[PDB]
Amino acid sequence: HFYTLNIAEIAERIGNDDCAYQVLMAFINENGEAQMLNKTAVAEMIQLSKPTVFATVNWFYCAGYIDETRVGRSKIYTLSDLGVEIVECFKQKAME
Amino acid sequence: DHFYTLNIAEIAERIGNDDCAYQVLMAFINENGEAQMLNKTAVAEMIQLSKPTVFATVNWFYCAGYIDETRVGRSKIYTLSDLGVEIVECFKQKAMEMR
């Protein structure tokens, strides 16, 4: 069961969500490369209510934006191929 | 442009494991199994969960692309996007094959 979707419009929507945009963008180091993060570290990068930032990371998971990997004791998140593609819109939208 | 292919199965199970998400999704399917439309308030009312909680989900469901929003009179009303209908028609099937 696949579904093939115009990413550009979701990327628009997220891009209109103050809180969502920042949580996606965290996963991008200054070198323009994606990076792994746990929920705590993200919570720190962004000045916003730790609750809301945890809640945002959670749905991002759901939605399929960020992959989760079990590391020893804690859970660590990276962007999905989808997360990367959404960032790739933003990358190009800032460009032009 | 920017097209991308989701696995709907993978998104479904993820949603299936969130009590609030599942219910918010399913609220757009009526008694007769047809898809319907609601505003934020009507969703909140069907779900037996913190109105705040329901509102955050309806928000992010919108971001995710599961629902679209249509202006009417003096009321932003929500309806499943095609994606949202994908996600349901997937739950519907897992339940279908079950019985």
Swiss-Prot record, chain B:
InterPro entries, alphabetized: WH-like_DNA-bd_sf, WH_DNA-bd_sf
Usage in biotechnology: A miniplasmid containing this and downstream gene tubZ is able to replicate in B.thuringiensis subsp. israelensis and express insect toxin proteins. The miniplasmid could be used to make plasmids for insect toxin overexpression.
Domain of life: Bacteria
Entry's Gene Ontology BP terms: plasmid partitioning
Recorded consequence of changing residue 40 to A: No DNA binding
Gene3D superfamilies referenced in this protein's UniProt entry, alphabetically: Winged helix-like DNA-binding domain superfamily/Winged helix DNA-binding domain
Record flagged with keyword GTP-binding: no
Entry remark concerning the domains of this protein: Although this has the same function as TubR of B.cereus strain ATCC 10987 there is little sequence homology and the dimerization interface is different.
Miscellaneous note of the record: The pBtoxis plasmid encodes all the major endotoxin proteins (Cyt1Aa, Cry4Aa, Cry4Ba, and Cry11Aa) responsible for the mosquito larvicidal activity of strain 4Q2.
Protein's name according to its UniProt entry: DNA-binding transcriptional repressor TubR
Organism: Bacillus thuringiensis subsp. israelensis
